Amino acid sequence: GKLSEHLRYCDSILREMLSKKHAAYAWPFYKPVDAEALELHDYHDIIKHPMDLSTVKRKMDGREYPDAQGFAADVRLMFSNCYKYNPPDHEVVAMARKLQDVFEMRFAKMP
């Protein structure tokens, strides 16, 4: 089935995003947002479905995505949360944009 072929290619996108090359801008998305440690009393009012690369990895390694589109939806959700919660001039936003540049480019190049 070409459904798991695409998902295996998405595991490579995930490895690329977690890789040491992109760490200057990707590290805020390694683990979930700790709203209590960052004193974001606001975060879970606005972000109803948090997402991060480690949760995406957990779901991928557990075969929880039925197809590549579900994986892409979660990665983009992680980006959309960051754009939604933060003021557009914050530099977590620039960091998220640099990482999304990696994701969208490698996703489009899927055979």
Ligand SMILES: CCOc1cc(C(=O)N2CCC(N3CCN(C)CC3)CC2)ccc1Nc1ncc2c(n1)N(C1CCCC1)c1ccccc1C(=O)N2C
């Ligand atoms: C597992 C460790 O976790 C964190 C630890 C610490 C920490 O105390 N030290 C102290 C000095 C830090 N410095 C200052 C800033 N410098 C750009 C780099 C060096 C290094 C580490 C800070 C943030 C963390 N984790 C996080 N995870 C998601 C988000 C997130 N931070 N940022 C920040 C990342 C950098 C700027 C924004 C957010 C902050 C507020 C609201 C939303 C978000 C948000 O959207 N994301 C995705």
